[PDB]
Amino acid sequence: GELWGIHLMPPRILVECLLPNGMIVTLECLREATLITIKHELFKEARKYPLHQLLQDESSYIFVSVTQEAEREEFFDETRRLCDLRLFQPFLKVIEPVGNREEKILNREIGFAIGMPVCEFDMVKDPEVQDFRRNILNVCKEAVDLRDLNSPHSRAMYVYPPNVESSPELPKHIYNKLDKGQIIVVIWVIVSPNNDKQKYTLKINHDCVPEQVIAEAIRKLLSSEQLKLCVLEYQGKYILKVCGCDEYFLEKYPLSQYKYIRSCIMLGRMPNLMLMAKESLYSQLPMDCFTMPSYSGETSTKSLWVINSALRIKILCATYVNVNIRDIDKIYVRTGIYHGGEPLCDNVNTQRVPCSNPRWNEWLNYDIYIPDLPRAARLCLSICSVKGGAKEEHCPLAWGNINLFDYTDTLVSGKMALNLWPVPHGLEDLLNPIGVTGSNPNKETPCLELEFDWFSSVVKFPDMSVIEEHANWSVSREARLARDNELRENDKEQLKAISTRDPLSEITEQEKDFLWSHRHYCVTIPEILPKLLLSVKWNSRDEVAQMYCLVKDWPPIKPEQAMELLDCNYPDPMVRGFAVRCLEKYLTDDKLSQYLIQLVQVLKYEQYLDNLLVRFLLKKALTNQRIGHFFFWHLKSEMHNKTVSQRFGLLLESYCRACGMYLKHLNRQVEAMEKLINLTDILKQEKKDETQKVQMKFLVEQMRRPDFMDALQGFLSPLNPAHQLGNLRLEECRIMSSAKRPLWLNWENPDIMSELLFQNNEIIFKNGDDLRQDMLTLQIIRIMENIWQNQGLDLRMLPYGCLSIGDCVGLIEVVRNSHTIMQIQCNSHTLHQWLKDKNKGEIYDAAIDLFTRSCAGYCVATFILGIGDRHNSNIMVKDDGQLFHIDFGHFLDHKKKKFGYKRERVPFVLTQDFLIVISKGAQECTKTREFERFQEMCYKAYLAIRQHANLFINLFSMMLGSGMPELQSFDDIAYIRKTLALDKTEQEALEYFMKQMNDAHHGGWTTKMDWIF
Amino acid sequence: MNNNMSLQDAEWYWGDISREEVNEKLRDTADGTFLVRDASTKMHGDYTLTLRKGGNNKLIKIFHRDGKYGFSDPLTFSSVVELINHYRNESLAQYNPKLDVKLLYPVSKYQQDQVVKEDNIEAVGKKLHEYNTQFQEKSREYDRLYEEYTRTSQEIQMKRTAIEAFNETIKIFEEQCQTQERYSKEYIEKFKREGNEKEIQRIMHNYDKLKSRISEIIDSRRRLEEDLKKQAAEYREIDKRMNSIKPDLIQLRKTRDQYLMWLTQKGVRQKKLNEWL
């Protein structure tokens, strides 16, 4: 609502005006009215009331009121209409403005972007929060200096970064689509203000730099030798632009390396590249201004390694617990000292006590020496219940995690209170080590009081120089030893074999002792690092100290392998720093965008607000606006969640402070989505029993309002910020049939050359259902497509855009010309007849091939991921033959629970309808040449993903703290290990795959025993 | 009796179950709990002993060569049953001083048989249906309570913010009283002289309107405080109901799994399991 308890207010409405002479003036006002129009009306009527002798002019004062977010907001932009103020109640107080105007405008623009007032960060006592706010600004100022160093090209490269692949090398199947290694490309030019578009058709080498493409354009009857004059002087004149897009080829990459050009080759489409002046775009850039905000006896210190004492913690009491005293028998506090997901010692419980009296007052003793506590050691705890022939069930009531060391490396001491968190849906584990650290900010909440020991005023974890000294001392006692004994051939082969195991294939105790014995030789095979780290005794400072020295000079590893080390099983800062430094060196902006969803989710596992990963991602977000766009939206989408509100809020502030002009573009996107959220709330609450006809009329009348028309037009698509959303085709916007009332929206593409790409942009807005599962599944599909393309498998998938923008709020890209199977069928030959009728003629084999290739990838992809069962409404088919899937819903076979079946099912079973299409209308569709070729495409594709299994396990391991019910534990991720058959042999994995298909198809999936007979 | 037993009949032997299936059965169990599965068909070794130590699962590969079994060279045990039973009555300190513990509590594959004493297949299949029906019923009841819990959490937070907004509004209108009291005292004390009560009438009328509006807002904040107290109580009550269902859900699921386990043994058809589930 825009006024508390109200969606919107009638134009005529009263406002209580509190003047500085002490007087209150109820004023007739308009909703449309800007602030000075109201201030005109106010001082017009203020003559009547007492002490009019005591007011300055209207220009001397400013209005102030309370907002929906309980903020005392001063309204400086007085062209803001009243409904867009978001007042709590209709009142305004005029005052004389004090303090910095520039800063308060920016702070409220940042506040609107984030979804919380920036002033709430001022109130946070926690020194880590205030230190983060100050110290993170170094990355901000560093980021703006990087994009102004080689100005104004770096300025343009920030806003319109080159959308490219990682590698310049083409796969052979891409190169062979070109004519003699050349692409036919059309360059468009505007005439003048007349706009009578013209085209210069070119044919050039695929590896041509945009400079060379511009050079060929000016050729397409004058002197020949004079051409060297214009191509040197007027090369910087022009720059290339994609038609129908806000996307530019500003960098000297090969033409084929750009994503649009690579996309145009595969589809068989003419690439259309508008020629445009460089001065036109360069002067258009904002030249933005980042400014530093306004918030920019002796201690008896002691080392951790000096404390001669075992660990103990005192559990005092809990304030309350929500338990029926009749049903539950006892309660207690479960407790553990964790390093990531691994207990450093045995978990210790308090004594059992009555439900009514949660009071313990006992020291729990742990068998771990305080000096052996690793840097990332955490207390994990919960208040658990007991219910219960001498059999009993233990359940968690609430949970909480505490870092044993704070952000300044100080060991915790004395009494502290921990407000606990509610248990996530589906978690039956008594402790929640994967969950975030820190107290619950809601104080109306179970609060466990506890007391750590006190040894001195400040107990610090030792410095790296002190650790190296102990490492050298420890290795001397145990039996240059890197090269003193020689690595045998038998030992060398086993080290290579251990390194090929996947992230979740646990090393044995023999393999642990073997890896640690050969820790000095492991440097030769640096991809073994994650196995070596698992072999360390993390509850032994001797072994940990030696690992630090090995990690210090460890050869850097590939980004995909470094991403393993960012999950919840590797919490040590030296390991995580190493991982981040691999990404800094070797992670391209392309692959950062590919894996950004996971890298943002990794921030939830970080012990502290300030770490090396968040500085890396913030910097990359502030130096690449494509990365910055999705960085913003992934963080913003979870600002409702109080486990990460503070962290993501602080991070989003830092971003919005330094991102420059894009904050204005983001604010329009936020404003647009908020208005769609509000309308769909009203449809679901108020218009529940109303018909879809009436809901449409309600929608159209609300959307036709000028306030909505300004907000919902002329902004950038959150699915792709290159796609500009112009005017609404409001007549063609519709409500979908689904329970949550999704809006099929339709916008004009306002680009000057829109017709050459698309004239309109269709997006499905969705409020009720969680779209993170589909967002993730669609990301994985795109990655699966990329693996297959580079390996020669042309299996074209359709990873259409999907972005979660809030709490179960998301957007979905509409694929044009796509139809469900249920529409086509409405007889087993109907599908083949439709596809033939849509591509009737000589271009029939190209459509059937594209269908068969599309079926293959989705058959394999869906089997691997365990998506929800495919029916005719879930499967779609395009005009050109491309089949694809929608509404993945759940994955990793999440509905294995609420059922007894351990079996791995086949979501996408090929009925006879699909088999007849692949066989080109044949009767015995399971026996033909085309079907046997289809099988081999499924098998090749299956083995290609198995070979890249580590990547997919690593990506899912980064998501475990997301809050998705499908990814709570490593048990859930282990579904893909079973479908990829990673414990089995490659040949056995193929046999497994065949057997699963054959069981699902009821014999119809012809086995390897094909009968020529 | 013991060492002459076959490996197939051994309670602690589980065959080709996955490493994750082992983790399920060992999750949050006491030290000394153990079982044996087949080793991964990609790796060296035949079987894998998994056991609890310091709240962690320790995996120990059992190798084979020329009639002898063991963790490492030399292989000294005539069978797997001899190897296990040896470390049931003796510490693994012998093998490795690091892990001083015995194999105390075998995770039996005949555990379900102790619970489900009924020998008949169809009878056990009918109980599976009864338990699965009860489990799905309580699961849906919990799912409804959790939807309410999350909805109530959202509405409580909106009310909490509205109270803060009311308190800011009450502060601003209270500041206006001080602003009035400040500038009124200088003028009213002058305008009491010159006999102009029309001036005091019009000023005090406005001051009483300010005091009238404050009273209304404070009462509106007071009413919202009671609504919050009402809903905060409901929130705790919804949490109580969920905490009573949780232990019953764990028991029903574990009992269903045992009745499923009993029917996986004796090779019951997959279509018969789906009809009961």
Ligand SMILES: Nc1cc(O)cc(-c2nc(N3CCOCC3)c3sccc3n2)c1
């Ligand atoms: N829940 C859900 C999740 C999800 O990823 C997609 C859908 C979804 N998507 C559709 N399209 C339009 C064509 O382009 C691709 C997406 C359609 S068309 C008719 C129903 C429907 N439902 C629904």
